Design a protein around this nucleic acid. Structure first.
Lengths: 150, 187, 96, 203, 94
RNA sequence: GUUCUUUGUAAAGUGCCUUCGAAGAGUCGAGUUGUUUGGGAAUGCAGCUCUAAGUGGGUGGUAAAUUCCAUCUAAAGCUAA
RNA sequence: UUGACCUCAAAUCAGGUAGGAGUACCCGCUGAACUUAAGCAUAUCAAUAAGCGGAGGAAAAGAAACCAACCGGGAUUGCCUUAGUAACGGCGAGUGAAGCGGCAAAAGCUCAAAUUUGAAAUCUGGUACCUUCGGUGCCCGAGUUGUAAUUUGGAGAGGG
């Protein structure tokens, strides 16, 4: 499309001396990780999607704390592999949406009210517990039989 | 007399004798003559500042430094980027906090741009017959302190009690200030 | 201002001074607006390190005199122990 | 961007999050080989300020070295000398463990040139390092003249002569009045001043 | 024997001495005969002892009666007294 | 030097007013142990343990506390004679 | 049930590269003793010979976390000099630098860290054609966990 769009502009520039107002305004998801973090802390983002599995985990772990600070309604979607498909990459690791068309505006604000109920509201009490109490099932049967006998 | 010689090491392995002194001089003058054909209109060395030396033994002298400053070059009316093309060394890490050295380097710059002529990029290249030493065209001048003869004005300050009281005031400065606060801190 | 003689409190020749342009590489220490925002964000994520835990139980119990002695020895020097224990007073003040 | 957040959060190495990652990743690195290829850097910010550019021809290796001193290889501790040199267990090996880590990956991948290296993780037995290497035969490196300086054949085996960032540190090469014995190289400035200079006209 | 001086450098201690005997070899030769034949306080020759490379002025001989303006970093008591009898000031330069 | 090709609504430089100014971490540093040179309660490097800060950090050849002042900007890199 | 992704593999896969020799000089590591002290352990010989790793026509160092205490100097190297001096040593034998000054040679600079976000603007390879140390056009690929353009502290950027 970009290889289509530039020659579509190039015929318009020489003939009509137009100021590239021939191309309309785009609307698309903003996807780069250093680009999403720059769109937050300016309060310029509406939704921020976060992949749960990132192989250097240290990359992403400040984003649920940073999105709570600036007030952006984050979400933790599953899969970096799914996020690459919608934005023409293999992996994406974030996907944020700055703007949306006005006819699609009311569909967005309904969706944010469901997401913040699960994530940004629970954030106060997520910090007060620790995970990882799971044991292997041979060890799990070992202590349940004893506690039943005790 | 006791005499100290440090020859216990294997010193005959490291002995360098300079038979090549007369040989390296002929090679070095051929290096300058080959450069002065390659750089054929230009004077083989960049222009240097007037700089007063440090270290109380040597501060009476004045000496050719490395480069001017960003401040002295702007005072002459040219950028530092263009100044290196003209033949003017620029030292970015030096600072000016004296005025007579600042006024000496600027006057050294006003003389320099009049003496040079810079060829156009386009062509027609007027033949100019290079002068091989830019230091010899702009010599380093020893500044003059005072006139030769003056009249005698005498105030009786005695000039050695001057040095004596200036010495004792440095030595006893700290203890007298400790007295001066204890008077103030009372009650 | 130098006096103009060889010895004393202000030795050396009297010459007029220019007080030149301030170098940019003197203000390396002053932070930003942004790095203050970053370091405030990372402290609430990371939490306190284990010896910093042993300071905030020690200032509340045994006063600030004993706290500088432990913070002298866990860190390197004594002047760095001033910069740490002064931070731990700011932690408790933000708590209450 | 995440440049600065990763820079600060790596500094808190005893916080409750990082000592979790330091204890999970120390298990994974023992299970692999001594030298094995990392597909991508585990510390992307620290790799990037050392010169990593994620394109074709920048290879990250992960290496494991032994912690500890150096025991002298004389048989049964018999040094055969004046009663100093009997010292065996207290000997300390002037090169760091970081430069030893660069030489093992250097002798393995010989076509590659070692650019730099950095710390990752440690244990009581092993220190771990992650080494950034540059391919000089790849065509994306022989062009784009920010990086064609390494294809110059004076840069052959930088890690073994001590020219890297930890190489120039262990030699003790910085400016100052402290570094008099090693400012132009140690054995060059030795030979300079232990030399009897004799001119033609004797001074 | 005495106390030690770590990092000694002979720039702190640069101070060559000049006796009052010479004191006129600093003046060049051709002008010398004119200044000796004048008792004028109006025209007295200014001798810069630092620019010739002399730290201190010491009094060792006797000087003639012509008044002389001397610039110096350091003078002794007896040297400043002996110039003052000739009618010459001693200005301290840095 | 001589000859035909013009790259550019491209690029660079300078004056003024404001808001700014991101600057390298198991590192700098300290303890101890060995090794080194003129470096003298520690000149370098290395091992282990401890491990920072941001008007901060390093040095200013006698340790430490307290108050100043000067000077440069480390832990990433290239380059002829 | 197909279709990606991550990590790990294989092939006489397409194209590449490293080892060895020389080793006077160069950058490291490792490292003795005979000897001197009229003994000798210290110290010295020596941060040297031997052993090992790695380069070039030069290598190395280099654009200050510098020297300084001045009316201040200004990347590194080399010479004259500082100097057999300060300094350390069974304070014995012995060892022994650096800053200034003159001179030779002269040259400066690059990333990381700023959202292009009204458009990954960047790059290897494969294949046709060509004016071939390459160029142009299409197609896969790398790549948003960051490739260009802009900036390197002497500054510099965003608006006017």
């Amino acid at each position: 499309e970009k290889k289509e769009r530039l020659t579509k502009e190039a015929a318009a520039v020489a003939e009509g001396k137009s100021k590239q107002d021939a191309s309309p305004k785009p609307y698309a998801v903003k996807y780069g990780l250093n680009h999403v973090v720059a769109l937050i802390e300016n309060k310029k983002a509406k939704l921020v999607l976060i992949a749960n599995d990132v192989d250097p985990i240290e990359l992403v772990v400040f984003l649920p704390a940073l999105c709570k600070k600036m007030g952006v309604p984050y979400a933790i979607v599953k899969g970096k592999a799914r996020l690459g498909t919608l934005v023409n990459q293999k992996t994406s690791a974030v996907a944020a949406l700055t703007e949306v068309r006005a006819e699609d505006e009311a569909a967005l604000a309904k969706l944010v009210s469901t997401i913040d109920a699960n994530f940004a509201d629970k954030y106060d009490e997520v910090k007060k517990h620790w995970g990882g109490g799971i044991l292997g099932n041979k060890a799990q049967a070992k202590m349940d039989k004893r506690a039943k006998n005790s | 007399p006791i005499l100290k010689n440090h020859f216990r090491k294997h010193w005959q392995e490291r002995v360098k004798v300079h038979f090549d002194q007369a040989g390296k001089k002929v090679s070095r003058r051929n290096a300058r003559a080959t450069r002065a054909a390659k750089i054929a209109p230009r004077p083989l060395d960049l222009l240097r500042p007037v700089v007063r030396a440090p270290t109380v033994k040597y501060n009476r002298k004045v000496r050719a430094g490395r480069g001017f400053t960003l401040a002295e070059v702007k005072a002459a009316g040219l950028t530092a980027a263009y100044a290196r093309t003209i033949g003017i060394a620029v030292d970015h890490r030096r600072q000016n906090r004296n005025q007579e050295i600042f006024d000496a380097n600027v006057q050294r710059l006003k003389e320099y741009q009049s003496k040079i002529i810079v060829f156009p990029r386009n062509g027609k290249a007027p033949e100019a017959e290079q002068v091989l030493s830019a230091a010899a065209t702009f010599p380093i001048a020893q500044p003059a302190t005072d006139v030769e003869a003056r009249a005698v004005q005498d105030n009786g300050e005695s000039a050695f009690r001057t040095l004596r009281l200036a010495r004792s005031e440095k030595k006893f400065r700290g203890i007298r200030e400790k007295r001066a606060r204890e008077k103030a801190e009372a009650e | 201002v130098k006096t103009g003689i060889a010895i004393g409190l202000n030795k050396g020749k009297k010459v007029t001074s220019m007080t030149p342009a301030p170098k940019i590489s003197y203000k390396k220490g002053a932070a930003s607006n942004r790095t203050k925002f970053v370091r405030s964000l990372v402290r609430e994520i990371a939490g306190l390190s284990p010896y910093e835990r042993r300071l905030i139980d020690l200032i509340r119990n045994s006063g600030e005199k004993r706290a500088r002695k432990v913070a002298k020895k866990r860190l390197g020097s004594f002047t760095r122990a001033k910069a740490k224990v002064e931070e731990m007073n700011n932690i408790i003040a933000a708590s209450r | 961007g995440a440049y600065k957040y990763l820079e600060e959060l790596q500094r808190k190495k005893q916080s409750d999050v990082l000592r979790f990652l330091q204890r999970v990743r120390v298990w994974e690195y023992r299970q692999k080989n001594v030298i094995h290829r990392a597909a991508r850097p585990t510390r992307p910010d620290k790799a990037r300020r050392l010169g990593y550019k994620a394109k074709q021809g920048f290879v990250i290796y992960r290496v494991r070295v032994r912690r500890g001193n150096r025991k002298r290889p004389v048989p049964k501790g018999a040094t055969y000398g004046k009663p100093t040199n009997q010292g065996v267990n207290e000997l300390k090996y002037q090169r760091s463990l970081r430069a030893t880590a660069e030489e093992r990956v250097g002798r393995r991948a010989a076509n590659l040139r070692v650019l730099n290296s950095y710390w990752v993780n440690q244990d009581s037995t092993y220190k771990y390092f992650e080494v950034i290497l540059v391919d000089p035969q790849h065509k994306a490196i022989r062009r784009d003249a920010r990086y064609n300086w390494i294809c110059d054949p004076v840069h052959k085996h930088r890690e073994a002569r001590g020219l890297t960032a930890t190489g120039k540190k262990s030699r003790g090469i910085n400016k100052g009045h402290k570094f008099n014995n090693t400012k132009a190289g140690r054995r060059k400035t030795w030979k300079r001043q232990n030399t009897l200079s004799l001119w033609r006209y004797r001074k | 024997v005495g106390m030690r001086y770590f990092h000694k450098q002979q720039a702190h201690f640069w101070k060559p001495v000049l006796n009052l005997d010479k004191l006129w070899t600093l003046i060049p030769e051709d002008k010398r005969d004119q200044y000796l034949k004048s008792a004028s306080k109006e025209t007295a020759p200014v001798i810069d002892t630092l620019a010739a490379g002399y730290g201190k002025i010491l009094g060792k001989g006797r000087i003639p009666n012509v008044p002389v303006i001397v610039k110096a970093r350091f003078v002794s008591k007896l040297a400043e007294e002996k110039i003052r009898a000739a009618g010459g000031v001693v200005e301290l330069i840095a």
